[PDB]
Structure formats: structure tokens, C-alpha cells
Swiss-Prot record, chains A, B, C:
Disulfide bonds: C45-C52
Immunosuppression: annotated span: 28-44
Primary gene name: env
Protein name per Swiss-Prot or TrEMBL: Envelope glycoprotein gp95
Section of the entire sequence shown: 92 to 162 of 246
Family: Belongs to the Alpharetroviruses envelope glycoprotein family.
Carbohydrate attachment residues: N7, N55
Superkingdom classification of source: Viruses
Coiled-coil regions, chain positions: 6-39, 57-76
First and last residue of the signal peptide: none
Species whose genome carries this gene: Rous sarcoma virus subgroup A (strain Schmidt-Ruppin)
Length: 76, 76, 76
């Protein structure tokens, strides 16, 4: 049914949001590690494109609320 | 039609799953590279937040099967 | 309505595509940083699994056009 397709979509998006959140966290831990290494070479994060930045696209707020709204709409 | 919207959604999700899988793999290769560098400074991965961990959110199993179920449901 | 579910889905996918694009960019900047460090140890990217590669799964073209087609179809 349409409820079928819809519920599959939200289930799937749920899993995918959680994997992407997890990916982002790892990338930022990786960047922090990199900056410690640059430090130990006597270099600052400014010596490497992007390495000072820890404010990635983080539309996490927006996505969680829309996801909730979608579920509540799709499964009620 | 609804089949239209649905088939666009699964096509798109297909591409996105493949890009996210690929991203995760790269992040884990990046972390492995980092740990080799920490090693060469005489440090262990325990000296850097997260650097020992290679078990990221990996709901890949779950997502592939739901994706398959969605396609088969959406396009049959 | 179905337009409801649909418009929520595209809004959400929009945010997610933008976050994933942003993630990928960061991972590639992280890899570039890593390679500079390997260099400073007298090693080439060939000494570390994946570190030479900057051509990640990048189905960005395909996804943007399908996303556009989906919106135009879903919200018209
Ligand atoms: Cl990374």
C-alpha cells in the first residue's frame, strides 16, 4: 500500500540518518587527530586547507524534526 | 503518478547509499593512515579521541535489505 | 496528504544531500592533510591504503538532477 512504501522509506531514512551522523562525527575526530599531528610538526591548522574548520554542514536539527514530522504523518 | 514519485525516490536513494558507503570507507582508510602517523610519533591510537575505533555506525546490512524490499514493492 | 508525505521527503532529502556533500568535501580535505604529513615523514601516498585516491563515489551529478526532477514532479 502507500502506507507500505511510506513506512519503508522512513525506516530506511532513519537508518541512513544515524549512519551519516556517525560518519560526520568520525570525520571530525579524524580532523582533530590531524591537527594534533600538524602541531607536532610545528605547523598550525592554517597551514592546511580546511583543517581549522569543525563546523561542517550540520543540518541535524532540521532533519530530525522533519523526520519526526514525517513518521508521525506517515504512520498515524 | 505515485509510481513516478516512488521510483524517483528509490533511484535517488540508491545513488545516495552508494555514495555514503564510499564515504565511510574513505573515512576509515583516513583513520588507519592517521594511526600509522601517530605510531611514527611514538604514540598509540589511545592518545587521540576515537582513533582506535573502526566500528562506525554501519547499518549497511539493514539498509540494503530494506532498499531491496522497497524497490520490489515500489516497482512490481 | 500524499503531497504532504512527498514534500516532507524531498525537503528532508534536500537537507541530507547538502550534509553528505559537505561530509565528502571534509574527508577529502582530511586525506590531503594526511598526505602532506606522510610526505613530511618521507613517505608517498602509495605507502598507505587509499591515500592517493581523491575520486570517491561522487554521484553528485546524477543525484542533483533526480532531486530536481523529484521536486518538480512532487510539487507541481
Ligand atoms: Cl576523514
Amino acid at each position: 500500500y502507500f502506507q507500505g512504501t511510506a513506512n519503508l522509506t522512513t525506516s530506511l531514512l532513519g537508518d541512513l540518518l544515524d549512519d551519516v551522523t556517525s560518519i560526520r562525527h568520525a570525520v571530525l575526530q579524524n580532523r582533530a587527530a590531524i591537527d594534533f599531528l600538524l602541531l607536532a610538526h610545528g605547523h598550525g591548522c592554517e597551514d592546511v586547507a580546511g583543517m581549522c574548520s569543525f563546523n561542517l554542514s550540520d543540518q541535524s536539527e532540521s532533519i530530525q524534526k522533519k523526520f519526526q514530522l514525517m513518521k508521525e504523518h506517515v504512520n498515524k
